[PDB]
Amino acid sequence: LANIRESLIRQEDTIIYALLQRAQFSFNAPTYDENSFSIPGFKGSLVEFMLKETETLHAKVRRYQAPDEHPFFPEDLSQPILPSLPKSRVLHPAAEKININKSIWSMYLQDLLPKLTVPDDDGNYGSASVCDVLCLQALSKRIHYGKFVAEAKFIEDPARFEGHIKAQDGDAILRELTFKNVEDNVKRRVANKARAYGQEVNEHGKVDNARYKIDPDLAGALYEDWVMPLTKQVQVAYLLRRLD
Amino acid sequence: EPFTLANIRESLIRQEDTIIYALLQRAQFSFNAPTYDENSFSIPGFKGSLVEFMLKETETLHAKVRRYQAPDEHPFFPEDLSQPRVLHPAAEKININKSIWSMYLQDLLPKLTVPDDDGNYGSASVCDVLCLQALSKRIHYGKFVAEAKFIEDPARFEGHIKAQDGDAILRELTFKNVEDNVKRRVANKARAYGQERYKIDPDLAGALYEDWVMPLTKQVQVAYLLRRLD
Ligand SMILES: N[C@@H](Cc1c[nH]c2ccccc12)C(=O)O
Numbered sequence: 001l002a003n004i005r006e007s008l009i010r011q012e013d014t015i016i017y018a019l020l021q022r023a024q025f026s027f028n029a030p031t032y033d034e035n036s037f038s039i040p041g042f043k044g045s046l047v048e049f050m051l052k053e054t055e056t057l058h059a060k061v062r063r064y065q066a067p068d069e070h071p072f073f074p075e076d077l078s079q080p081i082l083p084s085l086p087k088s089r090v091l092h093p094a095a096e097k098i099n100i101n102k103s104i105w106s107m108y109l110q111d112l113l114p115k116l117t118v119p120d121d122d123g124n125y126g127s128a129s130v131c132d133v134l135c136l137q138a139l140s141k142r143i144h145y146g147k148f149v150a151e152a153k154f155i156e157d158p159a160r161f162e163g164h165i166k167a168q169d170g171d172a173i174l175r176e177l178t179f180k181n182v183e184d185n186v187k188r189r190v191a192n193k194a195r196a197y198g199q200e201v202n203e204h205g206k207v208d209n210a211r212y213k214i215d216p217d218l219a220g221a222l223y224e225d226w227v228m229p230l231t232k233q234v235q236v237a238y239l240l241r242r243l244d
Numbered sequence: 245e246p247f248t249l250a251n252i253r254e255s256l257i258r259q260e261d262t263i264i265y266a267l268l269q270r271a272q273f274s275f276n277a278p279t280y281d282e283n284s285f286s287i288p289g290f291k292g293s294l295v296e297f298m299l300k301e302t303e304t305l306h307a308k309v310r311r312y313q314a315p316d317e318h319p320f321f322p323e324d325l326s327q328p329r330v331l332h333p334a335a336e337k338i339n340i341n342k343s344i345w346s347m348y349l350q351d352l353l354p355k356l357t358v359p360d361d362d363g364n365y366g367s368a369s370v371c372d373v374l375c376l377q378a379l380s381k382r383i384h385y386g387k388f389v390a391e392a393k394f395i396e397d398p399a400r401f402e403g404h405i406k407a408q409d410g411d412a413i414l415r416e417l418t419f420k421n422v423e424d425n426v427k428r429r430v431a432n433k434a435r436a437y438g439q440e441r442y443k444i445d446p447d448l449a450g451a452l453y454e455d456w457v458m459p460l461t462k463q464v465q466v467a468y469l470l471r472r473l474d
């Protein structure tokens with residue numbers, strides 16, 4: 001695993017696509033302001049509505065039965081309408097329950113999105129909110145996949161971590177974690193993929209003729225700055241609970 | 245702005261990317277036949293296939309927040325459309341989503357996916373919905389090309405429209421060299437995603453555009469222009 005490296009890459013690619021598509025629209029402030037829209041029968045903003053309704057539909061087809069899928073509205077999980085899949089046994093049962101979506105929500109809306117977009121309003125609230133939901137779900141999956149990354153690192157050499165864990169020494173755990181290949185050189189790699197989206201095979205365009213609005217270097221810096229620290233926090237949180 | 249000839253041209257080329265990427269996402273999962281069978285699952289209060297359910301539910305959500313008020317956005321289930329002047333009013337009547345639905349599910353999807361069942365009914369159907377919506381927007385987009393072309397040079401079409409000569413209009417809209425380059429570009433865009441053989445088969449993407457996407461857009465354009473003098 002290895003088998004995880006390819007998973008991580010797809011998760012990264014999915015985030016890059018989502019950010020790129022969201023960046024096709026402006027900030028569109030009313031999308032996030034419940035006092036700008038009175039959504040009939042619902043208390044909350046348009047993005048909250050779109051996310052809540054999306055999770056309702058996705059829960060019905062068993063999305064959150066998967067070990068890598070975490071709901072932003074866990075207290076509103078809708079009943080599935082498909083036969084249940086076998087429950088995953090890969091992660092440590094005591095450590096697998098981690099859900100930091102509240103942190104991911106505030107990161108996206110407050111730290112990432114305002115830097116990602118032009119602050120004006122182009123009126124495309126519907127499109128923006130749907131892009132937002134895709135961003136949120138893709139960010140959540142990548143960030144929480146730290147549980148699988150950490151489990152892999154642990155299983156390779158448990159004694160490497162077991163002393164730190166018994167001591168609840170989060171700083172030491174962090175220092176024992178290595179971040180290589182996909183976990184490194186993130187800014188440039190993400191920037192390069194954002195630039196390459198929509199290109200023909202081996203087509204190399206100058207910045208002059210970019211067909212999408214997103215700033216590729218900005219996308220890479222935002223991903224490294226705001227996405228990567230949260231996924232390391234998840235790895236540390238997972239290992240702290242790995243002997244629970 | 246969004247519907248000048250130049251802006252439309254660039255939108256169409258962005259939609260190439262959107263469609264190829266949507267297909268790529270769907271092709272990460274197998275055909276998963278129970279997704280398309282009415283008899284497979286017990287959906288309470290619903291008659292139809294899972295993909296039908298997922299699309300209907302998604303159209304209900306999106307209609308509520310005004311998606312189908314956009315002239316380029318066309319529901320697959322207008323009879324079930326729930327409550328929330330670029331084009332001639334005749335555009336509102338033109339919607340060939342039934343043909344797009346059949347093409348996607350019965351022609352494209354078996355070619356796109358591995359024939360078996362990997363159990364991922366939820367992911368597959370969510371991906372189906374995005375493919376369908378992207379195909380629909382692109383194919384119906386012709387409306388904007390036709391309107392911008394008519395606005396710029398009405399005398400080019402007015403005679404054919406007065407004569408209701410659809411074939412003549414179709415010839416006017418056909419640029420074979422341009423179409424050949426679209427096919428080439430789309431295949432190469434698919435090819436750019438590389439191998440997992442290919443993640444999204446270049447020849448399949450090229451064929452989709454040549455056999456279906458460009459012919460059906462033309463069919464929409466002719467249907468629109470024929471009614472443009474009403
Ligand atoms: N872009 C338009 C129409 C639209 C496209 N996709 C949507 C999805 C949901 C709601 C609206 C839309 C809007 O935001 O209103």
Ligand SMILES: N[C@@H](Cc1c[nH]c2ccccc12)C(=O)O
Binds near residue numbers: 069363364
């Ligand atoms: N793998 C399951 C559950 C699932 C995982 N991710 C999803 C995303 C959307 C819907 C469902 C899912 C399925 O595809 O059915």
